[PDB]
Amino acid sequence: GMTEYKLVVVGAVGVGKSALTIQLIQNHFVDEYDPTIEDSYRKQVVIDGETCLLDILDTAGQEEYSAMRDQYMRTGEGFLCVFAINNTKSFEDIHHYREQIKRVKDSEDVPMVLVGNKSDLPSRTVDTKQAQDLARSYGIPFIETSAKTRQGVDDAFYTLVREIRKHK
Template sequence: MMFGKSRTCNFAAVPERGQPECNVVVLGVMGSGKSALTVKFLTKRFISEYDPNLEDTYSTEEIVDQQPVVVKVMDTADQDGPVNCERYLTWANAFLVVYSIDNRLSFEGCQQYLQTITLHTKALQPYTPIILLGNKLDMERYRQVSQSDGSALASRFGCLFFEVSACLDFLSVQRVFHEAVKEARREGERSSPLRPLYISEDKPLVSLSSAASFASPRYTELPAPTTAKLVTVKSSRAQSKRRAPTLTLLKGFKIF
């Protein structure tokens, strides 16, 4: 089924597929490492070059807190910031807003995304969780954005905050995406009193700020972007061994 044709759900089992779904949108200015983070999560590999003009949507089957979920990740390609953003604002169950710790301009640019998201969702019930993510932790010696700056911005917008390296650390990247799923799941269950409360006991990552009270994410149908395509990757994080991904489907990337 092509992206944009299927309806998302509020973490209830999809009757025809038997698994819940979570839509995660990755935002940030060009050069912040959005695609590197996305591909690291999907394949455990790091990309050094990619086409910044491509916008792709990928799907992977994950096990999050012993519960299966289909995670759909939209790797966005906004050329002029959050201008034409309706395609993902009403589609997302969670947002990852990414900046590079060695690029102050990328940090300033991500503030526009945070403002756009909160302006869109503050009058809505339910609310969509947001994670502010400082990337390129391996570039520590060139750091231009301090952890305190990132934490302060996250507190200002009431979102979670992490720092990771798409180049070095797969587990931290994986846990950030899983945290996005957990937050969306929690908010979905808060808005559904008949469902049992979902509680996570996982420890937070480095530089995690307290999240403000959220309402559950909004779920609506979205027409597919003209450049979007859906790639399905089986996750090795289930108990069975993962098949090697078909790297030719990640067109425009150089995988190492």
């Protein structure tokens, strides 16, 4: 049967979680997507010759630590932690997202990729070395992406699927 992988995209508002998701789903860059819409989207993709079913939860909205929201995020098997390379605050937020993922998954070993989005822009404020070094601290991959040009998009999502397989 076809394996389904539940992937969750997290990070500060405005980093491009929806744009990255919709590039994967629609193969189109969408510069405008209601910042409050949290939803999940499925797509069949071939990864290393295996057709699998991706179910991608594009997170949005208010930070809340109810049992319900914890259980919703707990369904994720792997997480993309996204910051924007021209937004230092979004990078400084990453450790909080990672903390919460470890908490709800009750594991120090959750499949996870650090994603530096908006790589097409010239306004870089987060050095690549600093982001690579944070991924090294966590023992996870770092992928540079642009939802606008498609740079890194498959690499980010497909790496997460490969991590989920290894973890199994």
